């Protein structure tokens, strides 16, 4: 009778039981296959053999694109990670902003017809993160492994006409750090070496408040350079790579994208909303996702938004300590609300209407 919460990311699955403080199961959203003879392994079991296996990510840029492999991830989630029978548990799932209607229907079809869930619900990831912050109005910056979104939300509901999508997130930043590390003579190329650079990115990168000055003083700076110990015991040293990497979020041309940066897409998103709610959005900028973890990102965002907004506008950037999992925590909170029990889509209702019911109740 306990509800399940599953947040399917491009990089990581966050799954657990409604009412838990945090996701019990966090594991890679991959399916690996051995190269020879042209079975499969899911999640942690795929990475444990990352050498002999070819990896596929079933979710790309937050959108499910490989449904057979997605089914394996859901089966793995239920039976291996959570150790439940899905037909016994209402299941709350998440989706990306602007998820196509056919995808939402397919997800519902699979949950009821393949896994026989007794009930389910699909919620927008950014909406859950706002709820987790204690708000029903605000604008969320959700940046994970595969996609970044700006999502304005008013009185509980996202405004899809004003949502911005940016195909720039943590995986692209890791790839960029790999590239600029060649300037110090370092070669990181393989899948495993990419994982090392991801860890370097997470441990040593930060967002400069004034990028241009940070660059110009990088030479004379005593404390910019940091060391990192590799698995084999070898040490590397990096300097301005620490902040050039996540600067890409504000200057996507660093990787050859001419999209605006996340500060500008935040502004553009707000400007597509009605004048009378912009003040509420400026005062409630909530960040979520692993790629908003960089030290300094909130202060830089405050600075940039202030330069674009009206001079008298109250601006506040909220970066919760739990933002790596706030989407999941929001779903735990929602699925535990007594008022939400009417919002579940039951098997009875699916058998009557079919997958189209998800558009009406979600």
């Amino acid at each position: 009778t306990t509800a399940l919460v599953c947040d399917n990311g491009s990089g990581l699955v966050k799954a657990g039981f409604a009412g838990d403080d945090a996701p019990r199961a966090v594991f890679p959203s991959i399916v690996g296959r051995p190269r020879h003879q042209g079975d499969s392994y899911v999640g942690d079991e795929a990475q444990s053999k990352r050498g002999i296996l070819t990896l596929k990510y079933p979710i790309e840029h937050g959108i499910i694109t490989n449904w057979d492999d997605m089914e394996k991830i859901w089966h793995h989630t239920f039976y291996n990670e959570l150790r439940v029978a899905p037909e016994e548990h209402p299941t709350l799932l998440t989706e990306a902003p602007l998820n196509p209607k056919a995808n939402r229907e397919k997800m519902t079809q699979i949950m009821f017809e393949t896994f026989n869930v007794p009930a389910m619900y699909v919620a927008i990831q950014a909406v859950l993160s706002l709820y987790a912050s204690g708000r029903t109005t605000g604008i969320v910056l959700d940046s994970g492994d595969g996609v970044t979104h700006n999502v304005p939300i008013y009185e509980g509901y996202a405004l899809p006409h004003a949502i911005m999508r940016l195909d720039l997130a943590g995986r692209d930043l890791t790839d960029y750090l790999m590239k600029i590390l060649t300037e110090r003579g370092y070669s990181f190329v393989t899948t495993a070496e990419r994982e090392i650079v991801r860890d370097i990115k997470e441990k040593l990168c930060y967002v400069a408040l004034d990028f241009e000055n940070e660059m110009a003083t990088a030479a004379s700076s005593s404390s910019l350079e940091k060391s990192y110990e590799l698995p084999d015991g070898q040490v590397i040293t990096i300097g301005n790579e620490r902040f050039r990497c996540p600067e890409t979020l504000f200057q996507p041309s660093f990787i050859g994208m001419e999209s605006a940066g996340i500060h500008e897409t935040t502004y553009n998103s707000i400007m597509k909303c009605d004048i009378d709610i912009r003040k509420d959005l400026y005062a409630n900028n909530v960040m979520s996702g692993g790629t908003t973890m960089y030290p300094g990102i909130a202060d830089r965002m405050q600075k940039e938004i202030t330069a674009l907004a009206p001079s008298t506008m109250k601006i506040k950037i909220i970066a919760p300590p739990e933002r790596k999992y706030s989407v999941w925590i929001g779903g735990s909170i929602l699925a535990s609300l007594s008022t939400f029990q009417q919002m579940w889509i039951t098997k009875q209702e699916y058998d009557e209407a079919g997958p189209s019911i998800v558009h009406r109740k979600c």
């Binding site: 709820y131 204690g134 708000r135 029903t136 109005t137 009185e155 509980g156 003040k279 509420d280 005062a283 109250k314 909170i333 609300l337 008022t339």
Partner: protein, 88 residues
């Protein structure tokens, strides 16, 4: 004339008196300004998510009584001047 309600922690709607001291950071309140055909939904800074969610639902039902009134969600610390004059 002006009325004032409160959305409780146990979901009820209760009337309250509609001036100055009723404001408190942990409440969600509704004020009906008949002169301006406006329903103010006031949320305090420390209002828990589930009163905010239900404050939206309470304002919508009260608005069934006055279907052409304007519904204006407002927040502690940044209320419109018209609202401020309304109470003090």
């Amino acid at each position: 004339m002006v009325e004032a309600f409160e959305i409780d922690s146990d979901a009820k709607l209760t009337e309250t008196k509609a001036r100055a001291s009723t404001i408190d950071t942990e409440k969600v309140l509704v004020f009906i300004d008949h002169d301006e055909k406006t329903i103010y939904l006031w949320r305090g800074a420390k209002a828990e998510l589930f009163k905010k969610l239900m404050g939206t639902r309470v304002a919508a039902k009260l608005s069934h009584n006055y279907p052409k009134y304007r519904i204006r969600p407002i927040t502690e610390g940044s209320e419109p001047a018209a609202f401020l004059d309304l109470l003090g």
